[PDB]
Design a protein around this ligand. Structure first.
Ligand SMILES: CCCCCCCCCCCCCCCCCC(=O)OC[C@H](COP(=O)([O-])OCC(O)COP(=O)([O-])OC[C@@H](COC(=O)CCCCCCCCCCCCCCCCC)OC(=O)CCCCCCCCCCCCCCCCC)OC(=O)CCCCCCCCCCCCCCCCC
Ligand SMILES: CCCCCCCCCCCCCCCCCC(=O)OC[C@H](COP(=O)([O-])OCC[N+](C)(C)C)OC(=O)CCCCCCCCCCCCCCCCC
Ligand SMILES: CCCCCCCCCCCCCCCCCC(=O)OC[C@H](COP(=O)([O-])OCC[N+](C)(C)C)OC(=O)CCCCCCCCCCCCCCCCC
Ligand SMILES: CCCCCCCCCCCCCCCCCCCC(=O)O[C@H](COC(=O)CCCCCCCCCCCCCC)COP(=O)(O)OCCN
Ligand SMILES: CCCCCCCCCCCCCCCCCCCC(=O)O[C@H](COC(=O)CCCCCCCCCCCCCC)COP(=O)(O)OCCN
Ligand code: HEC
Ligand code: HEM
Ligand code: HEM
Ligand SMILES: CCCCCCCCCCCCO[C@@H]1O[C@H](CO)[C@@H](O[C@H]2O[C@H](CO)[C@@H](O)[C@H](O)[C@H]2O)[C@H](O)[C@H]1O
Ligand SMILES: CCCCCCCCCCCCO[C@@H]1O[C@H](CO)[C@@H](O[C@H]2O[C@H](CO)[C@@H](O)[C@H](O)[C@H]2O)[C@H](O)[C@H]1O
Ligand code: FES
Lengths: 85, 124, 54, 61, 71, 383, 244, 111
């Protein structure tokens, strides 16, 4: 499924012109400030829900479970603990 | 899964009025949130191609379609490495998201599945 | 500045020799500098600071 | 979008002084600094690490 | 004399007063309950450890930094 | 023709580290491969060094580790480096497996590197378990006791097999000496399998975060990924430095600084943090043998991802629903980890079972369902 | 578990050695050795510490040799193969108060006082636990706690009933540097000493960490410049497509 | 009388229990026992209480004959075991473990 340089196994390419400039001719950090602020905000915003939803749910679950467990092993929780065992 | 399976199931849904009424709007939003259009891909560009069947279907593409596919993949790869999105004409509009490959893969698979069936025929 | 490039950078043999000689200098000076800094932030705490009592 | 002799716009990234010795020298100063700290770090790493094989404090007692 | 003694007393009367009083009231209840007969043949014997821990935890939060400052 | 291509030996190196054609869009999660290689090298160097100072006999083992800490020049560093890198090895391996699951690296044509990878993961677990025993502190002994007794669950022969592992009737000197020998060996076996999974991968090349072919746009492994790998090497070393130099015992259990005592049983016997999810899975099943099977199945079920993922699309970059499901799966795996170190008490007992059900239902139900649905949505959605 | 069964968790005290750049206070270490020597050593061994380990940490070579030479250690047998004693040397380990575990337990109503060489690493809390435990014997157990005979109530110890009685009282030690020997002072000093005993490399380790952090940070900064420099041809690449 | 045989480092309490001792042990309602077990489960022979003589709390050896249930009392944290060697009072969670022992003869046991 992959070849090697010269015969990589690409469908025939035609009609694309690629251009680039030397590493010595470019500013490596061109537009870094804009990217660091605006680009990162865009990328983070677009992914935020996929992180926040599961983290918040499982943190809530853990919080409820740890708080119940703590309460069951108090004096006040004696009866509820007796039933739970 | 096979593309044949996906296409047949989708046709069952589009037939049923009730089902299409509830599925088609969902699928349109899904595709909007999927975000592949923001890298200038058409849906079909994303189908896994490292299978014998898909290699054969890609070899059957008309040269123009094939050349354009190569460009879209290269362009998307450049957006990906740059962490940029397509803008302007590079964004795939819904009308440009044509199923250019589905007919070819459906034909390749049709023959391969007929071959499997007929390899199991029993003279009655 | 051309001169500096030509002497220390152009030949890789020269560049590697410059890097290693700089590493030698850095290593010796950094050691000394950190020693002094460490002694100032931990002043009166270290054995060297109380040793004189004994 | 058609002529391939019309080089795309690279003005956002081109350095005006790109062919000067100053320009090259600076990038090699970064490469060289990195080589220098790698050399100093490797020397410290190797020296400290191999010293485990010299006589331990209980043996020297 | 031990700096801790003074700091602990001050923190109990001041910022940890609620917990001090909880512990006190607990002690009163338990001692009174031990005074009553057929206490030894009871199922559940209440202690004051919980209240003690709440008080000590509080005192320690208000004292730790102060104590180490005067050593 | 250039020597690096002409000479057979050089050409093998060249094919892996220099001319190797890589996708030009690998993101930083493709850097875990090299970090795992770095961990493996650090573990070999520090491990072989500790072996020069460690004594495997149970009468001397714990004391030899104290001798390393106290008397050997830089012994403290070599010991802490070895112990902490064992933790980082698992952080990187979970990251690497996470990358592989999210981006569909397990799909055809990469089932073979994935499957060999699952075995590497098992060897890493065995290696790290045995290494922990070698300290012969309280957690070393009691961890060995508890974990080796799980083999007693094997019907008919279980008891006999445990005595055979131990070389005796409890964990003791014979066990310690044999774990030393095997712990020394296992990293070399693990290095071999790591090399096999690479050779297997080299037929398809690396996947990439878009999940499309990269055959159209390749970049040499060097210099581009060489220099990009340095960034994460230095980031890794900074994290390594903060643990090894400034908080060397943050990831440890204090009880392992008490010499093993077969009479005194520690407060709570837990495995090292990186085994905790599997421990939680075991506790979830009440049956002893059931528990063991589930625990092994939790690892071996990874082998069926190639089958149960029915998507026509490789990886999750474009699949909002799969991304949500993946997020929940990963967080649940972390919850399992947490529940592995709580006491067997309400309400964590029931919660552990629910998380275990969620863990397996991802592979068996949700991923097959979700991947089938998204196939249909992509097709109908783009009509 | 009940909080009692866990033990009260010790406060976080601001130790001199807390702090990425902070060593032990060696004056405190020396005072803490004197507390170990005059109070704890009656019951607790410090087997992993040799006299030489004190040198250039708490004591000069001469002071430490003096401490070693005051003791008798087992020599190699004489020429008739009879056992012999010799005076201690710097290479000798600080000797324990009891010949074996059985003798230790017999002297402590069955409890075995642990070796203290590693106790700062072997308990959650470290210095803070040792300080909290030594200073945390209340005058009276919380009402309703039933102590087993020969146990003492201490909330920091798991279960609450500890076989070690309170031992630090104002002026049990006379410090040689004129520091007032209050319960708190002695606990702080001995806790610092024991922390040093557990991790004697601590001071050197943190200094080498400082050097590492600095070099590794610089290399990380430079590696980012170099990556960006070498990658710029790929990031900056532009395409023109003319469909054929 | 109660003997102490070391066996795999762990001490083994061997008590030659009297008739009335056996009776005393067979009384306690199993219900009220941290670790619920009857003497019958523990011994294979009522006249030979053989146990692993380490306290199940931390791991001192209980002083026999002492206690409050007159069996074994761990002096370390004050846990009381019975004439069955069952835990009755104190921090210890479990009853004193029983080794695998067999009566080869009626006058010799192997452990
Ligand atoms: C361990 C040893 C230490 C060594 C360091 C290795 C760690 C590097 C790594 O793989 O992660 C960095 C990694 C940067 O990788 P990258 O090559 O910039 O982008 C990879 C993704 O495509 C980036 O995804 P994207 O382009 O969609 O951007 C997403 C990202 C923004 O990515 C960043 O650039 C940061 O932001 C988030 O997802 C944040 C979640 C929202 C929370 C609020 O950061 C993340 O992707 C973090 C998100 C993970 C969840
Ligand atoms: C790990 C140990 C690190 C050792 C590096 C120490 C010195 C080597 C160095 O910096 O290489 C610079 C050199 C030069 O970098 P260069 O090859 O980019 O520079 C060549 C161009 N001139 C000579 C005009 C500057 O790299 C090497 O020679 C490769 C050896 C590195 C391994
Ligand atoms: C914590 C839960 C993580 C949820 C991740 C969801 C995706 C996301 O936002 O991540 C950002 C990015 C999103 O990247 P992406 O490649 O999907 O999208 C890039 C942007 N576009 C769409 C324009 C191309 O995801 C990653 O980089 C994910 C790697 C996963 C590593 C998981 C390690 C966990 C260990 C468990 C082992 C068993
Ligand atoms: C630890 C320190 C890391 C490496 C230090 C090497 C010095 C780096 C500076 C030297 C340098 O830039 O020159 C290149 C050397 O890099 C190289 O030849 C190597 C490039 C980067 C090395 C690291 C590769 C991946 C790191 C991850 C570890 C892998 C896992 C295994 C443990 C030459 O190369 P050029 O082509 O840029 O020269 C262009 C002209 N000749
Ligand atoms: C094996 C474990 C690998 C992890 C290395 C990280 C730090 C270990 C170095 C030991 C150390 O404490 O060195 C400090 C400086 O750190 C540093 O400056 C070292 C950080 C550099 C990171 C790695 C760079 C190359 C290392 C790998 C190459 C090894 C083989 C190649 C030849 C200070 O120690 P010191 O300065 O007192 O030392 C005497 C010389 N004055
Ligand atoms: C005369 C007896 C005695 C003296 C004096 C003594 N201890 Fe102890 N210590 C014990 C005994 C016995 C235990 C075990 C208690 C138990 O396990 O119930 C112990 C336990 C400890 C523990 C650990 C408790 C645990 O978590 O297991 C520390 C730490 C400790 N001692 C430190 C000291 C320090 C510091 C001093 C004095 C500066 C000191 N001891 C003085 C008898 C003593
Ligand atoms: C010592 C442990 C390991 C080492 C050193 C290692 C190293 C690597 C390296 C260098 C690569 C290529 C670059 C990269 O993608 O990061 C790679 C790819 C891969 N590894 Fe690992 N690996 C290890 C363990 C594992 C494990 C446990 C798995 C799976 C469970 C695994 C599955 C894979 C797969 C599927 C790929 C191809 C991914 C892709 O590029 O799309 N490896 N590994
Ligand atoms: C994948 C590679 C390895 C892993 C994951 C690994 C893991 C571990 C772990 C977790 C420990 C317990 C450390 C502690 O808490 O002190 C350890 C100890 C040890 N390992 Fe390894 N190890 C590896 C490779 C090696 C190798 C190759 C050797 C060569 C002999 C080795 C020798 C030792 C020795 C001698 C100890 C005991 C001394 C000690 O505890 O520090 N290890 N290892
Ligand atoms: C091909 C490679 C060449 C051979 C490699 C040589 C390996 C061993 C050589 C030196 C090892 C011992 O050499 C010794 O190193 C240690 C640091 O490790 C230095 O020691 C210095 O720093 C350490 C901690 O960093 C302190 O404990 C010490 O008090 C201080 O003097 C000594 O000043 C040096 O004399
Ligand atoms: C990772 C550390 C570096 C050491 C190298 C790893 C050791 C593993 C190497 C032995 C495995 C065989 O490696 C195999 O060899 C040949 C040539 O070398 C490669 O062959 C590839 O490159 C050569 C030229 O570079 C071409 O002739 C060939 O058409 C192409 O497929 C295979 O793609 C690779 O799978
Ligand atoms: S040690 Fe047996 S009572 Fe605590």
């Amino acid at each position: 499924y992959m070849g090697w340089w010269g015969h990589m196994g690409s469908p025939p390419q035609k009609g694309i012109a690629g251009y680039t400039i030397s590493p010595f001719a470019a500013r490596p950090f061109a537009g870094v400030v804009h990217a660091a602020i605006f680009n990162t905000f865009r990328r983070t915003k677009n992914q935020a829900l996929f992180v926040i939803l599961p983290v918040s749910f499982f943190y809530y679950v853990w919080t409820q479970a740890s708080e119940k467990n703590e309460w069951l092993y108090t004096k006040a929780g004696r009866h509820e603990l007796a039933k739970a065992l | 899964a096979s593309i044949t399976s996906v296409v047949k199931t989708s046709e069952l849904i589009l037939k049923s009025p009730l089902l299409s009424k509830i599925v088609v709007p969902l699928a349109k939003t899904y595709v909007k949130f999927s975000g592949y259009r923001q890298l200038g891909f058409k849906m079909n560009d994303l189908i896994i191609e490292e299978t014998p069947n898909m290699q054969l279907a890609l070899r059957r593409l008309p040269p123009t379609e094939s050349y354009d596919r190569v460009y879209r993949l290269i362009r998307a790869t450049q957006f990906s490495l740059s962490h940029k999105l397509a803008t302007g004409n590079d964004i795939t509009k819904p009308e440009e998201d044509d199923h250019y490959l589905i007919p070819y893969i459906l034909d390749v698979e049709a023959e391969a599945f007929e071959k499997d069936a007929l390899d199991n025929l029993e003279v009655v | 500045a051309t001169t500096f490039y030509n002497v220390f950078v152009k030949r890789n043999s020269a560049f590697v020799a410059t890097i290693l000689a700089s590493a030698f200098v850095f290593d010796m000076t950094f050691e000394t500098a950190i020693d002094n800094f460490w002694d100032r932030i931990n002043a009166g705490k270290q054995w060297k600071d109380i040793r004189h009592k004994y | 979008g058609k002529s391939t002799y019309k080089i795309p716009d690279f003005t956002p990234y081109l350095k005006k002084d790109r062919n000067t010795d100053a320009n090259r020298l600076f990038s090699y100063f970064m490469i060289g600094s990195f080589g220098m700290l790698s050399a100093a770090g490797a020397k410290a790493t190797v020296q400290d690490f191999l010293s485990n094989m010299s006589a331990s404090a209980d043996v020297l007692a | 004399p031990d700096p801790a003694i003074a700091l602990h007393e001050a923190a109990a009367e001041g910022p940890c007063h609620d917990f001090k009083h909880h512990f006190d009231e607990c002690v009163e209840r338990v001692t009174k309950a031990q005074e009553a007969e057929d206490y030894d043949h009871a199922e559940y014997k209440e202690d004051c450890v919980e209240e003690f821990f709440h008080l000590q935890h509080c005192i320690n939060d208000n004292t730790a930094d102060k104590l180490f400052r005067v050593l | 023709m250039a020597l690096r291509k002409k000479n057979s030996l050089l050409n093998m190196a060249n094919s892996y580290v220099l001319d190797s054609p890589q996708p030009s869009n690998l993101n930083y999660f493709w850097n875990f491969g090299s970090l795992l290689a770095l961990c493996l090298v650090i573990q070999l160097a520090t491990g072989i060094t500790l072996a020069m100072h460690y004594t495997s006999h149970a009468s001397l083992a714990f004391d030899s580790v104290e001798h390393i800490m106290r008397d050997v020049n830089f012994g403290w560093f070599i010991r802490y480096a070895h112990a902490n890198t064992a933790s980082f090895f698992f952080i990187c391996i979970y990251a690497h497996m996470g990358r592989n699951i999210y981006y569909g690296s397990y799909k055809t044509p990469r089932v073979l590197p994935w499957s060999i990878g699952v075995i590497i993961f098992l060897l890493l677990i065995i290696t790290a378990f045995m290494g922990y025993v070698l300290v012969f502190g309280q957690m070393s002994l009691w961890g060995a006791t508890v974990i080796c007794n799980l083999v007693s669950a094997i019907p008919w022969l279980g008891e006999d097999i445990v005595h055979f592992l131990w070389g005796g009737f409890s964990v003791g000197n014979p066990t310690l000496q044999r774990f030393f020998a095997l712990h020394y060996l296992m990293p070399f076996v693990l290095a071999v399998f790591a090399l096999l999974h690479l050779i297997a991968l080299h037929t398809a090349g690396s996947s990439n975060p878009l999940g499309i072919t990269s055959n159209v746009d390749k970049l040499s492994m060097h210099p581009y990924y060489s220099f990009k790998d340095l960034i994460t090497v230095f980031a890794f070393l900074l994290m390594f430095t903060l643990f090894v130099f400034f908080s060397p015992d943050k990831l440890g259990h204090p009880d392992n600084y008490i010499p093993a005592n077969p009479m005194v049983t520690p407060a709570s016997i837990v495995p090292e943090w990186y085994l905790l999810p599997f421990y939680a899975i075991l506790r979830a099943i009440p049956d002893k043998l059931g528990g063991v099977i589930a625990m092994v199945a939790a690892i071996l079920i990874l082998l069926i991802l190639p089958i149960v993922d029915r998507s026509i699309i490789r990886g999750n970059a474009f699949k909002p629903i799969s991304k949500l499901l993946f997020g929940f799966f990963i967080c649940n795996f972390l919850l399992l980890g947490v529940l592995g170190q709580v006491h067997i008490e309400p309400p964590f007992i029931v919660l552990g079972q629910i998380c275990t059900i969620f863990y397996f239902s991802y592979f068996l139900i949700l991923l097959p369902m979700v991947s089938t649905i998204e196939n249909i949505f992509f097709y109908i959605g783009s009509l | 578990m009940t909080a009692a069964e866990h033990g009260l968790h010790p406060a976080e005290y601001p130790w001199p050695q807390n702090g990425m750049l902070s060593t032990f206070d060696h004056a405190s270490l020396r005072r803490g050795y004197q507390v170990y020597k005059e109070v704890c050593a009656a019951c607790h061994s410090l087997d992993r510490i040799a006299w030489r380990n004190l040198v250039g940490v708490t004591h000069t070579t001469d002071e430490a040799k003096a401490f070693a030479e005051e003791l008798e250690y087992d020599d190699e047998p004489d020429d008739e193969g009879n056992p012999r004693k010799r005076p201690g040397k710097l290479a000798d380990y600080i000797p324990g108060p009891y010949p074996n575990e059985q003798a230790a337990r017999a002297a402590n109503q069955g409890a075995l006082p642990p070796d203290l060489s590693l106790i700062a690493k072997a308990r959650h809390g470290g210095a803070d636990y040792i300080f909290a435990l030594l200073t945390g014997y209340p005058d009276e157990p919380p009402a309703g706690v039933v102590l087993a005979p020969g146990m003492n109530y201490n909330p920091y110890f798991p279960g609450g009933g500890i076989g070690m009685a309170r031992t630090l009282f104002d002026g049990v030690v006379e410090y040689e540097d004129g520091t007032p020997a209050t319960t708190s002072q002695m606990a702080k000093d001995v806790a610092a000493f024991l922390t040093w005993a557990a991790e004697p490399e601590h001071d050197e380790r943190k200094k080498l960490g400082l050097k590492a952090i600095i070099v590794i940070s610089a290399m990380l900064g430079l590696s980012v410049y170099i990556k960006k420099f070498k990658w710029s041809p790929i990031k900056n690449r532009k395409f023109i497509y003319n469909p054929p | 009388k109660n003997v102490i045989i070391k066996w795999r480092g762990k001490p083994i309490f061997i008590r030659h229990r009297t008739s009335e001792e056996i009776e005393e042990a067979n009384e306690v309602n199993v219900a009220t026992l941290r670790d619920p077990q009857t003497d019958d489960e523990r011994v294979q022979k009522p006249e030979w209480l053989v146990m692993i003589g380490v306290c199940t709390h931390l791991g001192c050896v209980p002083i026999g004959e002492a206690g409050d249930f007159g069996g074994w009392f761990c002096p370390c944290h004050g846990s009381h075991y019975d004439i069955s060697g069952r835990i009755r009072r104190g921090p210890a969670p479990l009853n004193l473990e029983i080794p695998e022992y067999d009566f080869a003869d009626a006058e010799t046991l192997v452990i």
